[PDB]
Design a protein around this ligand. Structure first.
Ligand SMILES: O=P(O)(O)O[C@H]1[C@@H](OP(=O)(O)O)[C@H](OP(=O)(O)O)[C@@H](OP(=O)(O)OP(=O)(O)O)[C@H](OP(=O)(O)O)[C@H]1OP(=O)(O)O
Length: 168
């Protein structure tokens, strides 16, 4: 429903999420997509009109989607979902070409993500989406490949800004 908040500039939907790390920072918590049962992503969801800050949305979504509780130790800033609209590929105009580079035709972002780094304090076996998704820890290398397989580079960018140990 329209409790959703949008960028007043780009009309992008405003989303907050967490990069949930283990205390040793060797692993990150991932959840399976609802629409696509095999795509592994990280907890995130739409900011609602009542919510006073992005941290609120991020910790609410981390609980609802991944039954995870922890403390926010870092602001990982913003990343954007620059996937083109559903209109794309049945359009006449598709790409915009430079002399030494190629780009997708200029379009507004779908989503603006505000990500936080969380240190996991507890994982509970029961949470609101406990039967709708799976949830598992992955090393950096495993995590990175999951996000490419999920076709979500903006989520990998968020992961890369975290303190996750990448030497594994
Ligand atoms: O609201 P959210 O943040 O929880 O995200 C929902 C959904 O939002 P909605 O509330 O408007 O339905 C997204 O729709 P858009 O905002 O992109 O239009 C959808 O992205 P999509 O276009 O299908 O793209 P992909 O599935 O190919 O990535 C996303 O798929 P995932 O991120 O892969 O899981 C879903 O995640 P969730 O259901 O939690 O697993």
């Amino acid at each position: 429903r329209e409790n959703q908040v949008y960028s007043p500039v780009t009309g992008a939907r405003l989303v907050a999420g967490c990069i949930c790390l283990t205390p040793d920072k060797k692993q990150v918590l991932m959840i399976t997509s609802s629409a696509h049962k095999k795509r592994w992503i990280v907890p995130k969801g739409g900011v609602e009109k009542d919510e006073p800050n992005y941290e609120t949305t991020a910790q609410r979504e981390t609980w609802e989607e991944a039954g995870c509780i922890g403390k926010i130790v870092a602001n990982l800033g913003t990343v954007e979902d620059m996937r083109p609209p559903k209109d794309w590929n049945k359009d006449i105009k598709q790409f915009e070409n430079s002399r030494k580079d190629s780009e997708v035709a200029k379009h507004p972002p779908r989503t603006e993500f505000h990500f936080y780094e969380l240190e996991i304090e507890n994982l509970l076996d029961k949470f609101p989406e406990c039967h709708k998704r799976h949830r598992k820890l992955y090393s950096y290398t495993e995590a990175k490949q999951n996000l490419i397989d999920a076709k979500r580079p903006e989520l990998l960018e968020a992961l890369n800004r975290s303190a996750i140990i990448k030497d594994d």
